Amino acid sequence: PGVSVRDVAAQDFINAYASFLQRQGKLEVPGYVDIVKTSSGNEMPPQDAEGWFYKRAASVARHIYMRKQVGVGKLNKLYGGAKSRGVRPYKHIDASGSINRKVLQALEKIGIVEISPKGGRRISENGQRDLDRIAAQTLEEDE
Amino acid sequence: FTPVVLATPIPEEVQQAQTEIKLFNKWSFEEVEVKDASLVDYVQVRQPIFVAHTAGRYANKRFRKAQCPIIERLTNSLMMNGRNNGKKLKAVRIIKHTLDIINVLTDQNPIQVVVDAITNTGPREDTTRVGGGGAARRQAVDVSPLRRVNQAIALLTIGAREAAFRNIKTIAETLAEELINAAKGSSTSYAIKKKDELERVAKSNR
Amino acid sequence: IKIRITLTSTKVKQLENVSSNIVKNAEQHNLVKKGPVRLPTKVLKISTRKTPNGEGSKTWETYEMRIHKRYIDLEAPVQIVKRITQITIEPGVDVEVVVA
Amino acid sequence: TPVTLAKVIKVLGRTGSRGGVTQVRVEFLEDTSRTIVRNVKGPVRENDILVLMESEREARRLR
Amino acid sequence: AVPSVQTFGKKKSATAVAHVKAGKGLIKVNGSPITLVEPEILRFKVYEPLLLVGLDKFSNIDIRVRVTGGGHVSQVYAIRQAIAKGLVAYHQKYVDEQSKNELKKAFTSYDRTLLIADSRRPEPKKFGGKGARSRFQKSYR
Amino acid sequence: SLVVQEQGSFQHILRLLNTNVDGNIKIVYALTTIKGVGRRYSNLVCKKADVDLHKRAGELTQEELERIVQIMQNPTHYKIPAWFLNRQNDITDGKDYHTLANNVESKLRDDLERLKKIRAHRGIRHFWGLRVRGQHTKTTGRRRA
Amino acid sequence: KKKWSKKSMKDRAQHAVILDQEKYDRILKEVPTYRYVSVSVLVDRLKIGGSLARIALRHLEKEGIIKPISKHSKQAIYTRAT
RNA sequence: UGACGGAGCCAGCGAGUCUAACCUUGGCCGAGAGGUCUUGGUAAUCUUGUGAAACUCCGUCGUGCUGGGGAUAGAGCAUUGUAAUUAUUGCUCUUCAACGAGGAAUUCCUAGUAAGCGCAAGUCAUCAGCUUGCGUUGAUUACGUCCCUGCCCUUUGUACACAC
RNA sequence: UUAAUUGCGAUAACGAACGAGACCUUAACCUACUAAAUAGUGGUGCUAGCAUUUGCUGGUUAUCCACUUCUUAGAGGGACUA
């Protein structure tokens, strides 16, 4: 029939890939998660305690795949939001870089993402090769 | 005619609707007529659109804002009360859910209920301010059909915003329950009570 | 040599004529070159109050300066390039040449 | 009381303290040639259909 | 040598450029299929052309769209105008003008913005007020 | 989707260190009723105690809270990096601590009194009740005395 | 000194949030004859907690008695199959 | 129609380098902040294909002075500043404080305006609730009137003349 | 009749000047002496999926080849109540 990445939905991909990462249990997270703010503007940590990092890794993996070169500061901007400075009007605030940095070196550690020229990250060959099993559930069910 | 398949995957439900005739997915945008000829050509029919988000040019002409689709006009007055100015992206979402909620009750055509609601709460006569000799009275005057639709949409949307405020009810379900009673006629819906109250006061202040 | 002469004047009419006669003078030497590249105009906006003191309605006048930058790519020997650029020099226009 | 339906045939002009109403000449839908002049609160125009909560009234002005 | 046509649609500040050729009946936006934006409100907006004249004009034509500028709803508007012009320009060059003038007549009747880029550009803001016409506040005592 | 049998063991009120802690509400937002532990601190103490976040204050066993209170009493024992606590490097001792339901007011009185006894600018301001963080007193704060 | 208040009364709502057998089997036998079932419908008719309404709704669709039509957030539209 | 947690990500004005460390790009482990190095364009290929706030599948509490609460205190962590104690500014932690469609009164507004939202520039030693520009999402009448306070013209009365 | 002491026009006035207008700035179709690979490129080179049948994205650096309709704004342009 023909196989391609983007020809599937985006909303079900991010969750399904994260469950793939969680089930495999190979992301190699040191464990200091569920402590830090995850964003200086976000005053509460993620609710999904057992997750929130398999999805974030899933989120960046799709993000780096669709882009060509990305950086730690760039992904902080992408995942950042608005900080409620109470009475002061809202302003855009970047996220903490450690969560984004250590989610990419984890992708490096397991083979999803390889370093790229001119600085930044890139979708790797191993990272793309495991998307076939990811899209298999989507294609089998609807057809 | 011979049907052929396509390598490119495009969903069948959209294709099936497009194949034979123009129509909504399951909603019957056709035969949504109103028995009252007074508001005819002042509620939108015979121009079925696929969604309540069309950026129709309504400021170029005196009345082109009145040839606007009646669902879009309903969507616009729901887009009010401060923090909801703009955000039409959700104002159509509520009407999508309200039409869903309207369908699950009152098994007849869901769209007809809205147009019957609008045609049922348009005040037929209200009273206007007259100065007199300082202060004498108020004078009752007839209401144009365009003014009717303006008030009929407003009262339905005012009632919903004031009903879902500070209560469990969502703006979608309560905007339905105002349209259910307005279309059927209950004298308890926010739009209907105000409609006859304005009519009643106009009768006294003829 | 892959020279790139640049032009950073403000008067468009002065820029357009001096660039037109830079191409025709370079073409009359039967040399290779590229046509002009029109970069976006760079308006410089100075928004200031009109009043000298702090009395009156808050009225503001916004002065603008238009900057027009144009570059043309040429490959011509320097012993003719020097005698090409310095001639037909125009007041107000800024015609300058770079090396590499 | 059974209300009546009516169609405008002529518009006279704006009246009222702030011009918020308009005089219109109106023809009855049944038993035509029965003219009537009514005041309309909203924007009205030619060949528009008017509802009257009562019929046998004629307000020539409004001040 | 491949029959192609490049066209544009515009919005308030969005712009979509369509590359329309004689292909395999595929429609794509920004490297992704047009059918999977799925916000369930504007799916029909980009579907409006093929929904009202069918796929008889979409059998062997591949369309790829690159939209940029504006916001989500604006980009979608540009996307519709890009694909609308591409089908118009495609039947202008290759297919009979009869096919083009009839699809323009249906597209115009359904929605003028399917052919005309909306001439409602924003109004610049002026001093003494928060917006173009709104003022700050008039205080008297 | 998960459903449970509700017994009489449900506690409409909880007794944590002489303070009434509400039941029938989330444990994380129930602990905010304690002076000194709020949305984040309750989030951490519940993570350390490994209590299911989805559960209420109703079906919580006594042991589940006894570790929660132990974390609240001695946070530095569980290897806390000393930036969550509300009292780091106390002036009286220099050691990392964390205030309690009744200790937060006691130390707030103690830290306010030392400014008062040394007659600092801050201390005379707290003794005066005026703003101490540089806020202008010309406009704000008229109906407060 | 005046504080410019109204201070209206309250109804003293009693939305129970931990459900026992009496409520569990009441909703189970009463989810029929309900043309429109939602989160707010459950709490305004069976007086259950707000989170119970959405959790129970997930339970009624997991086994399956009430057939959802619109799965949108902030507004859940479930009907009963007949 | 709302807060929070994810996640999807989309504009436009514009600025940035000599007796230069300003424009935080990536390889500073560092982790809000900024010291390491600067590989960096006569500033579309560097910040920024502005890659941002708003908005928008899915889930967390459900109408309470509640997850609408740093408004007000205390404790600590950082950089610009021969120097901040009357928070310079940013960051992490505790409690609810008034506030529950705000009285008389009052302001602005006729289109992609209003309104929601946020960003660049001026100020600037980092970081401004203001201004100037803007751009994102985008509402009810527009056949209006002079009674609603003031303009324009004419006629008329005046015992007014810087003149009701 | 005026978002106009704007004009048509009785006319002891005629002929004028200033103001209004006109003028200057933006959006956007000229596809031919307005574009560098400073922007989709039409064919370089291959890598990560399925069909051996016809896709979905990354790119060394002066061979280029019938190259310009989108933020770029000159010359008969265009909208004057056609």
XYZ file of C-alpha atoms in Angstrom, chain A:
143
model
C 0.000 0.000 0.000
C 2.905 2.321 0.753
C 4.403 3.360 4.079
C 5.275 6.867 5.239
C 5.668 8.645 8.559
C 3.527 11.777 8.281
C 0.603 10.019 6.585
C -0.649 9.079 10.076
C -2.210 11.193 12.808
C -0.059 13.356 15.065
C -2.049 13.120 18.299
C -2.084 9.318 18.557
C 1.574 9.040 17.510
C 2.994 10.966 20.474
C 1.092 8.898 23.028
C 1.706 5.565 21.285
C 5.448 6.195 20.936
C 5.661 7.161 24.611
C 3.976 3.909 25.629
C 6.501 2.162 23.394
C 9.333 3.867 25.277
C 7.733 3.191 28.664
C 7.085 -0.478 27.886
C 10.639 -1.015 26.615
C 12.146 0.727 29.637
C 15.424 1.615 27.933
C 15.413 5.438 28.012
C 17.966 5.375 30.884
C 16.643 8.221 33.030
C 18.918 8.911 36.038
C 15.876 9.423 38.265
C 15.987 12.960 39.618
C 12.695 13.625 37.777
C 9.454 14.535 39.602
C 11.414 17.113 41.616
C 12.088 20.091 39.361
C 9.553 22.643 38.126
C 9.860 21.440 34.479
C 9.314 25.128 33.628
C 9.937 28.279 35.670
C 6.578 29.603 34.461
C 4.826 26.315 35.276
C 4.185 26.493 39.016
C 3.017 22.859 39.284
C 4.836 19.683 38.179
C 3.289 17.213 35.723
C 0.317 15.208 36.954
C 1.338 12.056 35.049
C 4.030 11.086 37.540
C 4.832 7.657 36.095
C 5.088 9.247 32.646
C 5.687 12.870 31.582
C 9.153 11.862 30.379
C 8.358 9.045 27.975
C 5.941 11.513 26.375
C 8.468 14.358 26.477
C 11.018 12.072 24.824
C 8.302 11.016 22.388
C 7.464 14.691 21.863
C 11.045 15.736 21.123
C 11.666 12.665 18.951
C 8.846 13.644 16.603
C 9.927 17.283 16.868
C 13.564 16.619 15.945
C 12.415 14.323 13.131
C 10.288 17.015 11.480
C 12.981 19.666 11.984
C 16.589 19.500 10.771
C 18.707 21.030 13.555
C 17.426 21.971 17.027
C 19.075 23.171 20.215
C 18.581 23.063 23.964
C 17.459 26.690 24.071
C 15.170 26.211 21.077
C 13.264 23.344 22.699
C 12.959 25.331 25.920
C 11.169 27.993 23.878
C 8.972 25.406 22.154
C 7.835 23.813 25.427
C 7.663 27.081 27.360
C 4.534 29.052 28.075
C 3.364 32.061 30.039
C 4.284 32.714 33.660
C 1.485 34.092 35.828
C 3.244 36.936 37.625
C 0.108 37.517 39.673
C -0.926 41.140 39.273
C 1.761 41.750 36.646
C 0.572 40.926 33.103
C 1.683 37.683 31.530
C 5.022 37.221 29.759
C 6.591 34.355 27.843
C 9.014 32.316 29.956
C 11.446 29.629 28.818
C 11.589 26.175 30.379
C 14.448 24.673 32.357
C 17.145 23.357 30.053
C 18.075 20.239 32.013
C 14.834 18.448 31.257
C 15.239 19.150 27.552
C 19.000 18.558 27.528
C 18.837 15.242 29.379
C 15.896 14.048 27.281
C 18.034 14.465 24.163
C 21.201 12.831 25.489
C 18.899 10.002 26.562
C 17.829 9.808 22.918
C 21.525 9.837 22.032
C 22.149 7.166 24.673
C 19.548 4.774 23.238
C 20.233 5.659 19.594
C 17.191 7.697 18.565
C 19.036 10.963 17.905
C 22.517 11.662 16.522
C 24.527 14.872 16.714
C 24.410 17.024 13.586
C 26.728 19.501 11.861
C 26.409 23.247 12.441
C 25.304 22.439 15.996
C 22.195 20.688 17.265
C 20.510 17.308 16.968
C 19.108 15.229 14.120
C 16.755 12.308 13.596
C 19.045 9.292 13.429
C 18.814 6.137 11.348
C 18.026 3.996 14.388
C 15.444 6.543 15.519
C 13.565 6.280 12.229
C 13.857 2.495 11.943
C 11.700 1.928 15.038
C 8.847 4.064 13.685
C 7.754 1.193 11.424
C 6.659 -0.817 14.458
C 5.089 2.388 15.801
C 2.916 2.918 12.718
C 2.126 -0.803 12.451
C -0.657 -0.554 15.035
C -2.236 2.385 13.197
C -2.185 0.786 9.740
C -3.297 -2.691 10.830
C -6.375 -1.475 12.705
C -7.864 0.904 10.135
C -7.113 -1.320 7.125
